[PDB]
Structures are given as structure tokens and as C-alpha cells.
Amino acid sequence: TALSVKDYGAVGDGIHDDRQAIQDAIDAAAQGLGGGNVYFPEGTYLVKEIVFLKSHTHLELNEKATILNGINIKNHPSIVFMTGLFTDDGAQVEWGPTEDISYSGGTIDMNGALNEEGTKAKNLPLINSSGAFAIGNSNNVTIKNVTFKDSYQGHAIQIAGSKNVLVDNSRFLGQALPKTMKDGQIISKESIQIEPLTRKGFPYALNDDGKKSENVTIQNSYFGKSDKSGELVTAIGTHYQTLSTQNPSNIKIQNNHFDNMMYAGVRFTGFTDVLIKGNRFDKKVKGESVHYRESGAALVNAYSYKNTKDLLDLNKQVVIAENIFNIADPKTKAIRVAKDSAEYLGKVSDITVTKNVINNNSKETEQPNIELLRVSDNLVVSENSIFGGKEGIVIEDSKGKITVLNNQFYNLSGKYISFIK
Ligand SMILES: [Ca+2]
């Protein structure tokens, strides 16, 4: 059995800085004591600086254990757990490889709920963003049964340059968005981020070689609002790639429930070999939502980074199977896969959208249910079933073997299928 965090001087309270005590537990487990295991019994554990995870350690937390984020330093990350060293900006360090870390149970309160004004986080006034994990250059990482409360315009989890990562049976509740944020900064806030390892993408380290993430599964988890703040913008994805980034591959997103996102459940550019299967996406009406995007939304959005100069490795091998969407927002698309402008040099291909079910019961629906745009070869769109809305399927400017077979369309007002030239 495990090194207890209390034995190392963590006090259960709102108030005492437990950073050191917790770090000391971890450092001892790292050596092999308590057999790599660390246990957090019931409490609220305030940390006022970053805690470092260590190779071959396994943390388990009581259901009534919370980690409370009290990192409140100007020009400094406010991320509770990192898999490598960070002190201050401009003192970044290469992160060596780390492996075999597991983290299980309890809450992390990322503590970013807004002030009564809505310009800054109540308890963490000096910060620019809050979040729970920065996983860079790691292997075999399990995050399981955890409740993630209230990131402040930030990524609850960042998975950068990391292999064999699992997110299981967790919940993500609350993303806090200042009134002042422009749309471009809002939609870059994925709650779980899966990205190549670059300094621009992952500013916590020196690693800049663009190494991919690999074999990354997000499953059996729930994403929505909290009591203290509104709905996640984008549950899972990424919004950056370049000629030097190697594309995150074998990405499985399965059996999750994306409850009323502002923008997306899954939105990404630069992935290869992804599976989005048996998920549930709900989107409520503007009126029943704390957060809502007036420029509109797309629950699955496999899109193409804005570059007109380079031949990018754009999305390939995306499978979107057996999901179900209930949409009551007239402004929301269920499924979008795109090369967004004819001006982009890369190709998007091997795209299969199958056995999905969409109930769109919105009033005066302004959007198509499924949109495939500039897909170059191997496109299958099959045995999907679509209940309600204006247009059904739209396939636009697509070359190659295109299979469209045995879809069903019900009580749609506008065009079922629609091929555009
Ligand atoms: Ca520091």
C-alpha cells in the first residue's frame, strides 16, 4: 500500500499550502517507496505552485479529495500538474522523456470562475489561464475518474508529444470566459488538447521538434457546464499545425457525452487516423445556455489550418461512426469535414461518416446537418439517419471515389442530398 500524502504533511484544509508535502510524497514514490503508489484521502489540497508528476508513480485520490488550484502568479502558468520542470518564463528547460504515470479519483478544481465583473478569475486575479495537466513528452499516462472543475479560459488537459495516453471516465465541468474575449481567442480553448510538441503550442518547455502525440484515447466521460461557470467551448481537439509538426495519430474518441458545447465536441486540424464513435452530442437552444456562439457551431469539425503558402499534411483517415446528435439550436451543424478554402495546397482524404443519427428539432434551421467540403479521395457517407432540419447532406468540390449509400431522411424541409460543383 501507498505513501499517504498526510504522512508527508499535507493538511486537509482550504488554506495550508500542500505543494511541498504532495511533492515530497511523489518524490518518495518516484524512488520506489510504497511501491510507486500515492494516496490522497478525503480533503481539499491547496497548491500555490506547480506540482511535478514523476515516472512510474500512480496517484489515487478519495472521491472526496479535491486538488484546489491556488497558483496565482502574473506571467506564469497556472496549471496544477506538469510532467517536467518549470520555474519562470524565459527559464524554460528541455523536458526529458517520462513514462508510466497514472492518476485516479477525486476533483481538480482549476479555480477559474469569474469575478462578479466577469473580466478575471475571482480567486486567481493575476492569471491568464487555468488548467489541470500539462503532459509533454510522456508515455503510458492514465487519467481516470476525475472531475475537472472551472478552467479559466484554458485547457484542462494538454497532451503534447506524448504516446499511449488515456482519458477515462472523467468529467469536465465549467470553462470560464471573460466578457472581453474576441471570438478568435474563445474558439482556441479546447478542454482537452491533443497536439504536436512545439514551443509555440506548449510554451512550458524547450522541446521544439514537433514530435507527434500518439495512441491517445478519450472515453466514457462527460463534458458540460458547472454551477460556477458555463459550457466548454470545445471538448477535444487542436487548432495548430505547420510544415515542422508531425501529426497526432491513432486518436480514438469514444462513448463520451458532449453536453451542450459552445462550438464543438471534437474540433481539430492535422490529425491522422482518428475514430469518433458512439458519442452523444447535445446542443440546446440559445435560451437554455449560459454560453452561446452567435456565429454558429459544428459539433464535429475536422477542418484545415489557415495556410495558403505550404502543402500541409491536412486531416486524413477520419472515421465518424455511430454517434448521435440532438440539436435544438438552429445555428448548429452536426458534422463538418473540410478543406476550408480552395487556396490550401494540402489534401484531405479517407473520410467515412457512417451510421450516425441526427435529431435536429430546431426552429427555422439555418444550417445543413452534414457538410463535406473539398475532400480529395475515398469519401464514404453511409447508413446515416437524419430527423429534421433544412438540408441533410451536402458534398462540395470533392474528387475521387465517393460512396453515398443507404442514408435515410425524415421530415427534412430542404434538400436531402446536394452535390455542389
Ligand atoms: Ca514558478
Numbering used by the authors: 139 to 559
What does the literature reporting this entry say, word for word?
Mutants of S. pneumoniae R6 lacking the pfbA gene were deficient in the capacity for adherence to, and invasion of, human epithelial cells. Together, the results reveal a protein with an extended architecture that contains a core parallel β-helix structure with specific molecular features that we propose are most consistent with the recognition and perhaps processing of carbohydrates.
This motif is followed by a calcium-binding site, which appears to stabilize the initiation of the β-helix and is established by sidechain contributions from E187 and H214, and the main chain carbonyl oxygen of T225. The PfbAβ groove runs the length of the protein face, ∼50 Å, is open at one end and ends blindly where it is blocked by the N-terminal helix-turn-helix motif and calcium-binding site. Last, there is a sequence-conserved motif comprising Q296, Q331, E333 and G339, which coordinates a well-ordered water. Thus, though PfbAβ displays significant structural similarities to polysaccharide lyases it does not appear to share their function.
